[PDB]
Amino acid sequence: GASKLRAVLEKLKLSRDDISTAAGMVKGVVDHLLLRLKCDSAFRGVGLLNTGSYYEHVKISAPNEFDVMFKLEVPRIQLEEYSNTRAYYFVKFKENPLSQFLEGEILSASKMLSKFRKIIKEEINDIKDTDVIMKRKRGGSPAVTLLISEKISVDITLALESKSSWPASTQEGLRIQNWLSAKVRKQLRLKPFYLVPKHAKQEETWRLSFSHIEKEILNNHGKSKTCCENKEEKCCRKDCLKLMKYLLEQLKERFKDKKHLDKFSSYHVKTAFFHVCTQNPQDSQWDRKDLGLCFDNCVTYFLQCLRTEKLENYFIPEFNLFSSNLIDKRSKEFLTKQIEYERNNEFPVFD
Numbered sequence: 001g002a003s004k005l006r007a008v009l010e011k012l013k014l015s016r017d018d019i020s021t022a023a024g025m026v027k028g029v030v031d032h033l034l035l036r037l038k039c040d041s042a043f044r045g046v047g048l049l050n051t052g053s054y055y056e057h058v059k060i061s062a063p064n065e066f067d068v069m070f071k072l073e074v075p076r077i078q079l080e081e082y083s084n085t086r087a088y089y090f091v092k093f094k095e096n097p098l099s100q101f102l103e104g105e106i107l108s109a110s111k112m113l114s115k116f117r118k119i120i121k122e123e124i125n126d127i128k129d130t131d132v133i134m135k136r137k138r139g140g141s142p143a144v145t146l147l148i149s150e151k152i153s154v155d156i157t158l159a160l161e162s163k164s165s166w167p168a169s170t171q172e173g174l175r176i177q178n179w180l181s182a183k184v185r186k187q188l189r190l191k192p193f194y195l196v197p198k199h200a201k202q203e204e205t206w207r208l209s210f211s212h213i214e215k216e217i218l219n220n221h222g223k224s225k226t227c228c229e230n231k232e233e234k235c236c237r238k239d240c241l242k243l244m245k246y247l248l249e250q251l252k253e254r255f256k257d258k259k260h261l262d263k264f265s266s267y268h269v270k271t272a273f274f275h276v277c278t279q280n281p282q283d284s285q286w287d288r289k290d291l292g293l294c295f296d297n298c299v300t301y302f303l304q305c306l307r308t309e310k311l312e313n314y315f316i317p318e319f320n321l322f323s324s325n326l327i328d329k330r331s332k333e334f335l336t337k338q339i340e341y342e343r344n345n346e347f348p349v350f351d
Ligand SMILES: O=C(O)Cc1csc(Nc2cccc(CNC(=O)c3cc(Br)ccc3O)c2)n1
Pocket: 087, 141, 142, 207, 208, 209, 210, 211, 214, 265, 267, 270, 271, 313, 314, 315, 316, 319
C-alpha cells in the first residue's frame, strides 16, 4: 500500500516546487499593504510573522491559496480569561497608539478590524496594475481575503504580539519534553505569544495563536539534531502530516454540498499529529520504510479522538477541540465512517 502513498506524495511535490509567478505577485501586494499600514499611528509597528516567507499554505491540495499573518506588538498588555474558556481572553492595558480602539477597559477587536479592513480596501484601489478584489466575510480571523488576477487568493490575519510569559492555561501544555527535550520546551516558551480576533459564543474576545511554534516544531522534528540530514536518519514524520492534511482536504471537497465537515480543519489534524509524535518520541518509530504502518497509526489515533469525543489542545490541555459543545456527534460519526471506508479501500479519494 505504501507505493500508493509515495505516489500521492510524488504528485503533491510536482505542483509545489514548479515555476510560478504567483509567489512574487503575492509578495508585491503584501509589501504594498504593509507600507500603507505603517503610515497609521495605531498600525505603526506592523509586519509579517515570518519575514522572507510569505508563501505559507493551510491547503496542500490548493497551491494558489496563500495564508499570511500581520503581527503588531502590544506592550503594557494585561489579559482577563473569558468565561473559564481557557483560550479566549479580553485585552486590557496599563494614552496608547490603539487608544482609538478602547471600549471601557476592553480593546475593541471589531473597531480594530474595521480600521484594518478600511485601509486595505483603499490600498487595493491604488493598484491599477493587477485586479485585486477584497472579499468580506464573518469569523474574526482570517480578517480579510484578497483575490489577485484570478484564482490566486491570500488570507491576511491581524495578530497582537506579547513579549511576556505565556498565560497560566499553557502551564501543562506543549508536552515535548520526552521528544524534542526540556531545554527546547524552556526556549520556545521564552518566545512571544500571539492573539487573533476570535468570537466565542457580542463579546470582543481574542484567542491564543501558536502558528510560530508549530512551524518551529515541524522544521526541527526529530529527537536527533541530524534527523533527515542523512541516509541513516530518514524519517516519515512530515509525510505523515502531509497525507493526513491531504485526506481531510479531499473528503471536505467531496462533501462540500453537505455541512458535516465544515467544522473540521487542518488544525484538528496538526493537534492530533503532535499528540502521536509525543506518544512515539523516538526517530526509530518513524523510519521511512514504515510509512504505511506510521500513517495507519496516525489515522487510528485521529479516529479514536472522533469516537471518544476527546482531542486536547496541544498548548492549552483543558481545552477539548472535539467536545459536543463545539462539534456535534453526528458530524464526527460522518467523518469516522468516511475515513474508515477510505482506509479499508486503500484511499480512493487520493486517486
Ligand atoms: O481560525 C479557525 O477557525 C481555525 C483554527 C485555528 S486555531 C483554532 N482553534 C483553537 C481553539 C482554542 C485554542 C487555540 C490555541 N491555538 C492552537 O492550538 C494552535 C494549534 C496549531 Br497546530 C497551530 C496554531 C494554533 O494557534 C486554537 N481554530
